[PDB]
Amino acid sequence: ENVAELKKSFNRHLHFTLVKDRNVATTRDYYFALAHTVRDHLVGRWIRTQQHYYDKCPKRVYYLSLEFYMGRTLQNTMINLGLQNACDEAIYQLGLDIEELEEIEEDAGLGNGGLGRLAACFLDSMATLGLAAYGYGIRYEYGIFNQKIRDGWQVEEADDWLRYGNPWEKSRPEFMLPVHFYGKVEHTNTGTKWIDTQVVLALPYDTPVPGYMNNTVNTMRLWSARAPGDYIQAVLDRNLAENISRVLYPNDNFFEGKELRLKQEYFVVAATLQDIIRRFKASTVFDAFPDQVAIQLNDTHPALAIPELMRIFVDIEKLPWSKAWELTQKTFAYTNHTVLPEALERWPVDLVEKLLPRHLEIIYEINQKHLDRIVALFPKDVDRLRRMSLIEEEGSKRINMAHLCIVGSHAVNGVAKIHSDIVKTKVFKDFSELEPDKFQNKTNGITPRRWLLLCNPGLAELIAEKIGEDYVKDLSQLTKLHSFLGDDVFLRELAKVKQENKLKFSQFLETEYKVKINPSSMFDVQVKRIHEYKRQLLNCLHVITMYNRIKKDPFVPRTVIIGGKAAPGYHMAKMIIKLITSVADVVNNDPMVGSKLKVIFLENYRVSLAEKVIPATDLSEQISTAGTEASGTGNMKFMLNGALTIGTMDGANVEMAEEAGEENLFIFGMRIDDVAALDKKGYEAKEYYEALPELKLVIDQIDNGFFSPKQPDLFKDIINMLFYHDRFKVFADYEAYVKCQDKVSQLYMNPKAWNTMVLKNIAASGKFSSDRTIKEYAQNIWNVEPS
Amino acid sequence: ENVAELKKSFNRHLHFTLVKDRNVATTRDYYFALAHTVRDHLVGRWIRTQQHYYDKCPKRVYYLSLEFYMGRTLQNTMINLGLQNACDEAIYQLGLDIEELEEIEEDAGLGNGGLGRLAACFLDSMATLGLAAYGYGIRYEYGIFNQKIRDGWQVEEADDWLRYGNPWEKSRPEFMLPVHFYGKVEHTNTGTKWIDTQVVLALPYDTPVPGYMNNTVNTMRLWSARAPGDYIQAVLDRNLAENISRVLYPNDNFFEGKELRLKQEYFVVAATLQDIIRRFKASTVFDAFPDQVAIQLNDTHPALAIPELMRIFVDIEKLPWSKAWELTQKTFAYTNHTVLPEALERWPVDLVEKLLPRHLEIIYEINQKHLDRIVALFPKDVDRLRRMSLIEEEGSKRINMAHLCIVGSHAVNGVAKIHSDIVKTKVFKDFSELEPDKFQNKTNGITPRRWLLLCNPGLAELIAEKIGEDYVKDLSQLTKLHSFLGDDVFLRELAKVKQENKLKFSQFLETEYKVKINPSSMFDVQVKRIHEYKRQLLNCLHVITMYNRIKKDPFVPRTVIIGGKAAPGYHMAKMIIKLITSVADVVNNDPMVGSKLKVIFLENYRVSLAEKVIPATDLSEQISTAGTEASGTGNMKFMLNGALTIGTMDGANVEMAEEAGEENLFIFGMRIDDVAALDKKGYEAKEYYEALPELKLVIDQIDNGFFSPKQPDLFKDIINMLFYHDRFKVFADYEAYVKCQDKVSQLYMNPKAWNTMVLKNIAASGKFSSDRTIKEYAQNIWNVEPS
Numbered sequence A, B: 001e002n003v004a005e006l007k008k009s010f011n012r013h014l015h016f017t018l019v020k021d022r023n024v025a026t027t028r029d030y031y032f033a034l035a036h037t038v039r040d041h042l043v044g045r046w047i048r049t050q051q052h053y054y055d056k057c058p059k060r061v062y063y064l065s066l067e068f069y070m071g072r073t074l075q076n077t078m079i080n081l082g083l084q085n086a087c088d089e090a091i092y093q094l095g096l097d098i099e100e101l102e103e104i105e106e107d108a109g110l111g112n113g114g115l116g117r118l119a120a121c122f123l124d125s126m127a128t129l130g131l132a133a134y135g136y137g138i139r140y141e142y143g144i145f146n147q148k149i150r151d152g153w154q155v156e157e158a159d160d161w162l163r164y165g166n167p168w169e170k171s172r173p174e175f176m177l178p179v180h181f182y183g184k185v186e187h188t189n190t191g192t193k194w195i196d197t198q199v200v201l202a203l204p205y206d207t208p209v210p211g212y213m214n215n216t217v218n219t220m221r222l223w224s225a226r227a228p229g230d231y232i233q234a235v236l237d238r239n240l241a242e243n244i245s246r247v248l249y250p251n252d253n254f255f256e257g258k259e260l261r262l263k264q265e266y267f268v269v270a271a272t273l274q275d276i277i278r279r280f281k282a283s284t285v286f287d288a289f290p291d292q293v294a295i296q297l298n299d300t301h302p303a304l305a306i307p308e309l310m311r312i313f314v315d316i317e318k319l320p321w322s323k324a325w326e327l328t329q330k331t332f333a334y335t336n337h338t339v340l341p342e343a344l345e346r347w348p349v350d351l352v353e354k355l356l357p358r359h360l361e362i363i364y365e366i367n368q369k370h371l372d373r374i375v376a377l378f379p380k381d382v383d384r385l386r387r388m389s390l391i392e393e394e395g396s397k398r399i400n401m402a403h404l405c406i407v408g409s410h411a412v413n414g415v416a417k418i419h420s421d422i423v424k425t426k427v428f429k430d431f432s433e434l435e436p437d438k439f440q441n442k443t444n445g446i447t448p449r450r451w452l453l454l455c456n457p458g459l460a461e462l463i464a465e466k467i468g469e470d471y472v473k474d475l476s477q478l479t480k481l482h483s484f485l486g487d488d489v490f491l492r493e494l495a496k497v498k499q500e501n502k503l504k505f506s507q508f509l510e511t512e513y514k515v516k517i518n519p520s521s522m523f524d525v526q527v528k529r530i531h532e533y534k535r536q537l538l539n540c541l542h543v544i545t546m547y548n549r550i551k552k553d554p555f556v557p558r559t560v561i562i563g564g565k566a567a568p569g570y571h572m573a574k575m576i577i578k579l580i581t582s583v584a585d586v587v588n589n590d591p592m593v594g595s596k597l598k599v600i601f602l603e604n605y606r607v608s609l610a611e612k613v614i615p616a617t618d619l620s621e622q623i624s625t626a627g628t629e630a631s632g633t634g635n636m637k638f639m640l641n642g643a644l645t646i647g648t649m650d651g652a653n654v655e656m657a658e659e660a661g662e663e664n665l666f667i668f669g670m671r672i673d674d675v676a677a678l679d680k681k682g683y684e685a686k687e688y689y690e691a692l693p694e695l696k697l698v699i700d701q702i703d704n705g706f707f708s709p710k711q712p713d714l715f716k717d718i719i720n721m722l723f724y725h726d727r728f729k730v731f732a733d734y735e736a737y738v739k740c741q742d743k744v745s746q747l748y749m750n751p752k753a754w755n756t757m758v759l760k761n762i763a764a765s766g767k768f769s770s771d772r773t774i775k776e777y778a779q780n781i782w783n784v785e786p787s
């Protein structure tokens, strides 16, 4: 692992692996040569790590998720293996730019946003904590679509990230497994039998998950679907079975009850459980299963894992229901990341019956023994029963997957105090009252490797020089930065790092779009999925408000960046995008405003891009309506990277305030109980429209066509929603939000005070390391021990 | 290179490439570890070879084919690189069985039979002759289907040979190209424009083609098709564009006018020509094109290459029609491998118009200037015009692709004297009369590497010890074996080699099927595609005839093996298969016959299997009806491997007779003119049925249900065809065939005489080396020079 050997290895791969020489080698060839050179360093530890788990048999943790928002692997692997500087040097000496090589790698965007990214950070933390952890998901041929902007609107493009091949995956053919669909049930004397099913093969692909500087390399196993004139059609028709793992459903906090999606859910669940059972057996027999296996259900998407495990225990392993049921509960733990009713997974019974007849039976059975227990405890409370039932039958009966996850798991957790409380005491009150100890909180976290050492080497280096490198593995150590609260030199060094990041990102912005970026402008950014509850619409109102101010009285200059993908079928989100692009068009071109204000819709927001924009932001927008963001994680990334936060008391924003002190965050707007009171009284949007002149103008402008002269009624739908159907009370926080924004500008005029607040935020980031999050999961849910 | 290094390299790959250790390594892992170890030895020479072609710029030969029946690559690569014994030793010392490892490799069955296999042998010979040759085809995700037998019938199974990955291919992303379909034509002032087309991307995959012991490694470039709620459907729909390179049409000598097939034809043609143009330019400008490029059209399947080249020259390179046309003719050469009218490619104009509007125009244009030339030469001969037209308009006009290939190429060749004569003087008489010198003959050949050194190391070794190793590169040297005609010891050594092959193959047969093989029985085999013209039906009649003889007078024992795949939609071929399996069932089980006669339908006949069965055969069945097999190549494989031939004077069978002397082949049946006379007089099948008692019985038995008691009328269709619609006069050769068969048995009773004839056959095999075939193509068509 010295420069000379890394270089010879690079040349060896370019030659034998890419079949190229320096004469005709492409940039892609160089990236691959480097990827392979780095990859070779993972094998030894990967083999030894998995060997170790088999020998020592520690309890294994299986993170079952439909999403793994991994991003790029090259740099992350180099850093965790402590190879980055040596590789950087090797590539430099070969006359190549390692950064250009790194940009060649496609993001493994097998996730939509927060949920999927949390799984990625967890895999990193679990490997860094030396846990015998495994990630189980689907190897979508197409991840979250690539987003482009045409005439101001979002346009989707298929993300075939595997086009040129993925060097970071290793197919494991010997572990292929069959998954069954449809067919019918038969209750023979030899047990229940699911027959006449269609079979789809599940081919596993393993991706190494290197812990940070610790010799352990865990595994992320993703399953790919494979089929088991007229002849030609039959061959072509193999595409149907393979379509199961073809595309990631692009919905963020929205349930789409498509049959193909249900197929994916069962697919990953069936293959995973079988693979887990097989491994357990390769280690009466299943009495130790729960002590050797923990399966975390990442949201209800893999809820079917409960009846599937039961199906395996009962129909296959011939275990009695009672025993199987206890083993099941001991095995599963469920994490709730949802709050919005539209995000709730509720599969119509008819669909499940046709696709998974045996599972429906097992679910009715579970529900039966579940309700019999309630009736026994509350003989008279009838509403209780249909309220706690796994089946809701109000015209088109459907299965409440969350309820199934609650009864089939020994632990249920929310992802932030405020959220876990709501989940426990409100959403699933009937359940928590019966099983208090079942519900928990596990406040989310982000990995400080990818989200600091990787994306912000400048900040990482500065911090390291002041307090050592212990913080990488123990982020709580960041509090030591408090000793520099008075250190003017340090405060200057901190701001410089931010400046460099902003300068670097500004070049990016300029090369990508025709807009001159004011390098000294405050970087105000809101990057996250486009959704009404996240309210980038409110941000847009504020942008317009600032525009009207400059026009009226021609101020802290700022570059307002808003980015995020909208689900293809999410109409309002797409309108909001067009709204933002429209507004940006007028503001960026109005000569009167000039360099005072610039607006950018950051296109194709994704993990690798987040790694670029976050380190360069000054003001982080986390303005969801109180009670809507279960937790949020971008908020944590911004905090860790030197940005101040403007947001509501929602999700983890609350805990960020607790950690750094509420005065060091720009909190504003209604709080959960405030929103409750307004719903009580009834929300009348027109009220604020009338009482708020700056607001009225903004609205009139967008509704009049000021931002769409060639098509004056373009934003009609947004207006109507905002006035008669805004479930997220956008106008209700407008004033508080705008006032808060001005305060931010005020502080920004004072570099010493601004960076002093930044330091307090960075120094209080510790809690938000996913390492801390995983330790809690390990200790209070999986009953597992680091290393 | 040496055993020690090959072993360390093997372990290195098992580790870094397969991520395995000896503990959990699978047999597949070992195969891959070895494949990679061997593959590394190809790179140096591969890079240097292609570099050399660029520097020295020799004229390049492009073999354009829809099929490349490659078989397995491992052993063939080891042999051509002179690494087999060293690798054998390495693997042995590692405690592994290299043969078991080799059996893991999937056949690259991207061909149906002879046509596709000829392309494979040619690539081998061209690389061995040091020609700057390239193979251009399609990388079908699914090759010729795997054939299984269920209840006696052929059952097809998708051949996903790429399931576990192909180590022998290297994707060349930087060379991806777009291919256009549909759209419409527009004749603008800036030239003709094909617009509003659908685009399919062509991704090339390169496979190395090592010459035999000569440092040159050529390239076989195969193209894969790639696409350039509602969103989900759109992504899934990408499968449509990708279906183009999905499956190989499983037809042998039969034209199926499916639109998807036409798509494949244009696909490979468009990508290839573009790739060729690009390379030429990377070397007024196109004046030297014909002197730098030769494109061999493997049958009419890639006929579209002619109008496509014209399209490129005219619509894109802006060359005047006249110039482009001359350059085109000088570039293309067409090989005709068809005789059967059903195999003739005739695309309906409407289909071509919709899919390739611009090409239809270019074809009408070609035809126009073509017919204007004829009218000018033969002002009165009207029938001449519609006889030589590229378009035949008898209700549903269609394009005669053969005619297009004839006018667009400077050379047209058949694949055997008898065939080339028929093609020249009969099928395309009107054309040859105008351009005598255009038509040629290039008798087919097989590579003595794969078909001797590889498949029959025993025979190869024996021959080498007697006459040296010069024959591998100059098969004509086999004539030296004539010096051993009296050598009893040698004759014994030769028979022993055959015995060993038979013993080895017998083990195979026994492990695969429940049938005790008489090791001393004569191995009578007919392996080739199932088709009425190939007449395995006649062979079946003879098998039944022998059965009835044993039953009557309870003789040289023999194992009759018949194998071959039937096109899925070929009804009669499938019936014939069931007929053979039915017959085998009764004969193998009749206790009276016992070990006197055994019948085996060799399942899944393919290249790797041919390499096993051929070296073990005594009697090679090449009984097509005179005038039906353009050439045949299995006939050559059997001859080279020590088998005697029983066949008609058809295709290359005639030249085999010329080479070895007709008395050394068991020729029989009607000859071309005999068949002509019978057609003249009119074929009355019933005649022989009446006059031939042994025949009548056979027929009565099969028609009565003797071979299908549970379903007496099963073979009705075969009976009817044989009596009223047998275009291949099966009964007409029955007697001559049976008499001939008896003579074979007679000779077989005399080991010295039999092997003496075998020696004369092997010693006269020389001419049938594809090296000789390629030399002729190079000298008289491509104007290229070996080495």
Ligand SMILES: O=C(NCCOCCOCCNC(=O)c1cc2cc(Cl)ccc2[nH]1)c1cc2cc(Cl)ccc2[nH]1
Pocket (backbone or CB within 6 Å): A016, A017, A018, A019, A039, A040, A042, A043, A046, A165, A167, A168, A169, A170, A171, A206, A207, A208, B016, B017, B018, B019, B039, B040, B042, B043, B046, B165, B167, B168, B169, B170, B171, B206, B207, B208
């Ligand atoms: O395709 C080629 N190279 C590209 C890289 O190969 C892709 C398949 O890789 C081999 C299987 N191994 C893995 O996929 C793998 C190893 C591995 C190790 C780690 Cl630690 C993680 C993931 C991993 N994946 C290729 C090279 C080449 C050279 C000649 Cl002469 C002929 C054909 C050829 N093809």
Ligand SMILES: *Cc1c(COP(=O)(O)O)cnc(C)c1O
Pocket (backbone or CB within 6 Å): A112, A113, A114, A117, A527, A528, A529, A605, A606, A607, A610, A631, A632, A633, A634, A635, A637
């Ligand atoms: C972290 C992250 C998210 C989650 O962002 P929130 O603001 O917490 O919704 C979404 N997308 C990407 C690409 C991320 O890296």
Ligand SMILES: *Cc1c(COP(=O)(O)O)cnc(C)c1O
Pocket (backbone or CB within 6 Å): B112, B113, B114, B115, B117, B527, B528, B529, B605, B606, B607, B610, B631, B632, B633, B634, B635, B637
């Ligand atoms: C050589 C070969 C053929 C051609 O056989 P003929 O008997 O010449 O038709 C067909 N299939 C395979 C697998 C071959 O090896």
Ligand SMILES: CC(=O)N[C@@H]1O[C@H](CO)[C@@H](O)[C@H](O)[C@H]1O
Pocket (backbone or CB within 6 Å): A114, A115, A118, A252, A253, A299, A337, A338, A343, A415, A444, A628, A629, A630, A631, A632, A633, A651
């Ligand atoms: C279903 C879903 O995608 N939920 C998302 O989960 C992540 C990870 O817990 C939270 O940070 C976020 O607030 C929430 O919107």
Ligand SMILES: CC(=O)N[C@@H]1O[C@H](CO)[C@@H](O)[C@H](O)[C@H]1O
Pocket (backbone or CB within 6 Å): B114, B115, B118, B252, B253, B254, B299, B337, B338, B343, B415, B444, B628, B629, B630, B631, B632, B633, B651
């Ligand atoms: C259309 C087609 O596949 N033709 C086949 O081509 C091969 C190669 O020339 C001949 O040997 C064979 O007799 C002939 O049937």
